[PDB]
Design a protein around this ligand. Structure first.
Ligand SMILES: [Fe+2]
Length: 207
């Protein structure tokens, strides 16, 4: 029996691909800079973000959505790097999702003390498609609950190279990241990067 129904934890799965993945995060950031987006309550997120791929998650007039254009540059988000595409496919396939074809990758950067409040990934057209998570750099405590608010939370440390394929029931769980502890990592220096691959466009975009 699993810790999270439908989730597939692949520890250190991206450990070897880590250095290249980071070079690509930096490349993506040179075009679409990391920016701290504004929350519903008007607060600035402590986590900094950016996207790559055809679609990118962002804020838009009191709402949140996937856009083919970066509002900060008025240009498309950078294309999905080969390292990203490859790693995701290998993880998705190993987890039993060979047809998963993400068109969006939200890149999160956590500086010491950065955290992500509880939320569900429900902005995607088809929730049967999983979300592949890739952690890099400083370790973080990932928390997840259930399908509804105020449900009992479970914690899980996510470390450098860890990949989790959130499929099945786990795909809809409320989740977040507790305040990042300060520290040092050879490849990221003083932060943690997290990539979350999503199939954000409707199936028609595949034809
Ligand atoms: Fe999320």
């Amino acid at each position: 029996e699993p810790l999270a129904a439908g989730a597939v934890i692949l520890r250190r799965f991206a450990f070897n691909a880590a250095e290249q993945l980071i070079r690509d995060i930096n490349d993506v950031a040179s075009q679409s800079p990391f920016r701290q987006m504004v929350t519903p309550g008007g607060y600035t997120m402590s986590v900094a973000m950016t996207n790559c791929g055809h679609l990118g998650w962002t804020t838009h007039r009191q709402g949140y959505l996937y856009s083919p254009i970066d509002p900060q540059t008025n240009k498309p988000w950078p294309a999905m790097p080969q390292s990203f595409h490859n790693l995701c496919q290998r993880a998705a396939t190993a987890a039993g999702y060979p047809d998963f074809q993400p068109d969006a990758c939200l890149i999160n950067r956590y500086a010491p003390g950065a955290k992500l409040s509880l939320h569900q990934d429900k902005d995607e057209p088809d929730l049967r498609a999983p979300i592949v998570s890739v952690s890099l750099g400083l370790p973080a405590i990932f928390q997840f609950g259930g399908l509804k608010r105020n449900d009992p939370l479970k914690r899980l440390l996510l470390e450098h190279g860890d990949v989790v394929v959130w499929g099945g029931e786990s795909r809809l769980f409320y989740h977040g990241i507790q305040p990042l502890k300060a520290g040092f990592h050879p490849l990221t220096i003083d932060c943690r990067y997290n990539l979350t691959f999503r199939q954000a466009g409707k199936k028609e975009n595949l034809y």
